[PDB]
């Protein structure tokens, strides 16, 4: 799945980026079964003050998580996953929840490419892991915590 | 709402960013009834030349707005909201309509959180506010202008 | 369409940006019939290290393409389009296919604006064009390469 994380520049240090990305990947794989390496966490940093809420300019603390998922998961499980991301980014980034916004958008996997391959749907992903395999299977194996 | 606003770097001065964030905030609350403080504006600045149209590179004038809503509103009203955003950002930012792109994507409210809480349905944002935590109500009340 | 392209900073030379944008514009125009100038390519550069896969930080090579489309096109056509984008970007940008992710999201044409004007349905693009103002038509005609 793709996790766009919008943050102000220099609110997350390198270690805190590694921590938040770990937490998000851990939550996603824990709740969906997705293989670790399929989770992109992609940090979009902008200068603090680029964020407005109700027209009031903000400091550097607001974190917005735009998660792009395959269609096919239950509303209950998406609710759990988003809450757990709220909690776990609170902890990893060591920031209060009030600054955490979380949105999941869903597409058909048939229009979703990861690592250059069309995603299967959660009716697969164990079987899916065949692929352009070898160079591909092994390129994925490394991008795992 | 979360409004992603993609613009070329330092094309809007901070004061102009404030003006565009108030155009958008005012538009969403006027047509939807939502609070003021629920409107996030997140400016993504990239250097000029990053926007290509028909393969032709651009200067710093393109504004692209990706507004993320929860589902439940009519097409008629969404068109009115997008049109008003086109016009009022044109004035606040001092840019022509021909440079303005606006896209609304919709999600179920149950898979969208912010200020650390799951959104309600568009029918009734008063309930949700009065039922939130007191510390959270007060933090949201600070982001209103 | 708007094609959000997430890239590592200063990994694409200006000419490589022109090549990637042209590759995506030509793919969309060729496979769908839309006019050249309707293809927006928006490059979002972040410093290498902002991208995590399975919790592992990457060098400056991961590319993610988030395409924003109107509704109405078939899964077959979207699949070919995503595949063509993967291949044509792999060559234009000189990147391996395993570094390429592509996601298409779709909205109703009535909640979508380009050049300050409401998009039509995909069965409409030519009839749609001629009735735009003569200045809006001509600003569009220059955005063709």
CB contact under 8 A, A38 and C54: yes
Could you give the CA distance from residue C104 to residue A106 in angstroms, rounded to a whole number?
10
A102 touches chain B (CB under 8 A): yes
Nearest chain C residue to B77 by CA: give it.
Answer: C111
C102 touches chain A (CB under 8 A): yes
CB contact under 8 A, B90 and C36: no
Domain locations along chain B:
2-142
Longest dimension (CA), chain A: 52
Please name which of B28, B42, B17, B2 lies closest in space to residue B94, comparing C-alpha atoms.
B17
- Chain B residues with CB under 8 Å of A72 CB are none
- Chain A residues with CB under 8 Å of C83 CB are 113, 118
Dihedral (CA of C55, A71, A100, B133) sign? negative
C100 touches chain A (CB under 8 A): yes
A43 touches chain B (CB under 8 A): no
Token code pair at residue B136:
């959270």
Token code pair at residue B45:
């600045």
Any bridge partners for residue B118, and if so which?
B113
Helix, strand, coil percent content, chain C, rounded in steps of 5: 40, 30, 30
CB contact under 8 A, A118 and C90: no
Q: Compute the nearest-CA separation of A63 from chain B (Å).
A: 10
Token code pair at residue A139:
């390129």
Q: Are C28 and C5 in contact (CB under 8 A)?
A: no
Could you give the CA distance from residue A12 to residue A34 in angstroms, rounded to a whole number?
26
Counted residue by residue, chain C has a size of 145
Burial bucket for residue C63 (CB in 10 Å: 0-12, 13-18, 19+): buried
Token code pair at residue B93:
């930012």
Contacting chains of A (3 CB pairs or more, <8 Å) are B, C
Burial bucket for residue C94 (CB in 10 Å: 0-12, 13-18, 19+): exposed
The single-letter DSSP state of residue B11 is S
Q: What are phi and psi of B101, to 5 degrees?
A: -115, 140
Burial bucket for residue B96 (CB in 10 Å: 0-12, 13-18, 19+): middle
Could you give the CA distance from residue A72 to residue B107 in angstroms, rounded to a whole number?
14
Range A134-143 contact pairs with CB under 8 angstroms and sequence separation of 24 or more: A135/C98, A136/C98, A139/A115, A139/C98, A140/A35, A140/A37, A140/A38, A140/A115, A140/C54, A141/A37, A142/A37, A142/C56, A143/A36, A143/A37, A143/C53, A143/C54, A143/C55, A143/C56, A143/C58
Any bridge partners for residue C66, and if so which?
C4, C103
Q: How were these coordinates obtained? A: X-ray
C86 touches chain A (CB under 8 A): yes
Contacting chains of B (3 CB pairs or more, <8 Å) are A, C
B75 touches chain C (CB under 8 A): yes
Q: Compute the nearest-CA separation of C105 from chain B (Å).
A: 9
Say which CATH topology domain B2-142 has: Macrophage Migration Inhibitory Factor (3.30.429)
| Resolution to 1 decimal place, in Å | 2.5
Ranges assigned E (strand) in chain A? 2-8, 40-46, 51-53, 56-57, 63-70, 100-107, 112-114, 117-118
Could you give the CA distance from residue B69 to residue B27 in angstroms, rounded to a whole number?
13
Nearest chain A residue to B70 by CA: give it.
Answer: A103
Token code pair at residue C142:
């220059």
In whole angstroms, how far apart are CA A43 and each of A40, A57, A62, B66, C48?
A: 10, 21, 13, 18, 10
**Residue at token pair 């921590």:** A19
Q: Compute the nearest-CA separation of C115 from chain B (Å).
A: 4
């Amino acid at each position: 799945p793709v996790y766009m994380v919008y943050v102000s520049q220099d609110r997350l240090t390198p270690s805190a980026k590694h921590a938040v990305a770990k937490a998000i990947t851990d939550a996603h794989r824990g709740l969906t079964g997705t293989q670790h390496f399929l989770a992109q966490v992609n940090f979009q940093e902008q200068p603090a003050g680029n964020v407005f809420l109700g027209g009031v300019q903000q400091g550097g603390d607001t974190i917005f998580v735009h998660g792009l998922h395959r269609e096919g998961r239950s509303a209950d499980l998406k609710g759990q996953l988003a809450q757990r991301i709220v909690d776990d980014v609170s902890v990893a980034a060591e920031i209060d929840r009030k600054h955490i916004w979380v949105y999941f958008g869903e597409m058909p996997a048939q229009q979703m490419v990861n690592y250059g391959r069309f995603l299967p749907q959660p009716g697969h992903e164990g079987e899916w892991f065949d692929n352009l395999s070898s160079d591909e299977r092994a390129f994925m194996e490394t991008n795992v915590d």
